[PDB]
Amino acid sequence: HHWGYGKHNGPEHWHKDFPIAKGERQSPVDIDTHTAKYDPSLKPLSVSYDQATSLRILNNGHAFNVEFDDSQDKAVLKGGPLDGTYRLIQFHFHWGSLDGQGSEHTVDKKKYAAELHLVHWNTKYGDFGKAVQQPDGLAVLGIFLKVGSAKPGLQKVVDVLDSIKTKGKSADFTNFDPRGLLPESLDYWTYPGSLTTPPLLECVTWIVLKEPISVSSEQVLKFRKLNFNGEGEPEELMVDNWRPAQPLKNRQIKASFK
Numbered sequence: 001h002h003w004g005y006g007k008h009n010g011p012e013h014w015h016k017d018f019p020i021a022k023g024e025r026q027s028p029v030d031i032d033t034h035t036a037k038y039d040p041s042l043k044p045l046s047v048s049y050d051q052a053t054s055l056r057i058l059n060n061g062h063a064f065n066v067e068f069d070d071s072q073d074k075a076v077l078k079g080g081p082l083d084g085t086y087r088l089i090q091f092h093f094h095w096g097s098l099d100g101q102g103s104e105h106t107v108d109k110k111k112y113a114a115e116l117h118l119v120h121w122n123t124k125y126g127d128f129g130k131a132v133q134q135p136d137g138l139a140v141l142g143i144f145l146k147v148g149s150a151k152p153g154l155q156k157v158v159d160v161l162d163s164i165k166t167k168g169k170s171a172d173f174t175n176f177d178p179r180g181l182l183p184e185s186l187d188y189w190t191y192p193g194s195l196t197t198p199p200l201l202e203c204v205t206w207i208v209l210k211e212p213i214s215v216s217s218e219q220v221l222k223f224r225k226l227n228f229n230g231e232g233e234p235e236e237l238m239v240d241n242w243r244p245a246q247p248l249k250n251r252q253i254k255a256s257f258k
């Protein structure tokens with residue numbers, strides 16, 4: 001009746017409504033460090049988030065998202081395997097029902113507690129809507145979350161979740177600096193892929209950081225208090241909103257580090 005993450009409308013069923021689910025460059029994938037290829041031609045990532053302007057945070061029934069004002073050439077991502085400039089539009093997370101799972105990408109089959117996705121679109125296409133129709137339209141920066149010490153820059157996000165528990169709930173969320181969610185190193189793996197949720201379009205250049213950020217057990221626990229349902233409907237906790245690894249096919253994962 002609509003896609004979701006349940007047993008009867010989850011990832012395994014998506015191909016019926018979106019045939020591209022069985023495509024040639026689907027994401028996420030397992031990053032095999034035995035086969036990842038170091039490429040000396042890969043340039044360092046250039047992240048310019050000082051002018052980032054957050055607007056609001058909302059629960060859309062798939063996860064929670066923080067939206068940014070991508071009107072001006074404010075926060076942009078460039079460098080790395082990218083040609084041109086990509087503007088930050090929003091970020092969201094994927095997590096599990098327990099600390100042992102939750103990430104979309106995996107490294108040598110290892111799953112992390114959660115995964116953060118910072119979504120950017122190629123300015124040469126004018127807007128996000130036109131960018132998703134192009135093979136090089138989007139660039140998503142993926143960051144793994146491991147459980148350990150708390151991440152100070154994430155607390156503002158965690159504390160506001162109590163106010164957007166159900167689908168449709170939103171809350172003003174201005175002055176949030178995404179630089180507080182980045183790890184020390186920007187070394188990365190990159191490969192051509194797709195959106196991990198329907199419509200599953202193959203328009204993404206994936207940039208997955210090698211270094212995960214540490215978040216406390218208390219912080220991740222708050223993620224699991226959200227609901228997939230809207231206020232008034234049967235309670236269904238928002239957990240395990242991740243897609244399993246897909247076939248690598250004829251693709252090569254490149255590493256920016258030796």
Ligand SMILES: N#Cc1ccc(N(Cc2ccc(OS(N)(=O)=O)c(Br)c2)n2cnnc2)cc1
Nearest residue numbers: 089090117119128138140194195196197198199
């Ligand atoms: N049709 C359609 C459609 C679906 C989702 C969006 N996203 C949110 C969004 C959600 C998932 C996503 O893919 S992912 N998991 O980051 O790989 C990406 Br990439 C972007 N969105 C919302 N506002 N800016 C982007 C936009 C259009």
Ligand SMILES: [Zn+2]
Nearest residue numbers: 032033034035
């Ligand atoms: Zn080996």
Ligand SMILES: [Zn+2]
Nearest residue numbers: 092094117196
């Ligand atoms: Zn995502």
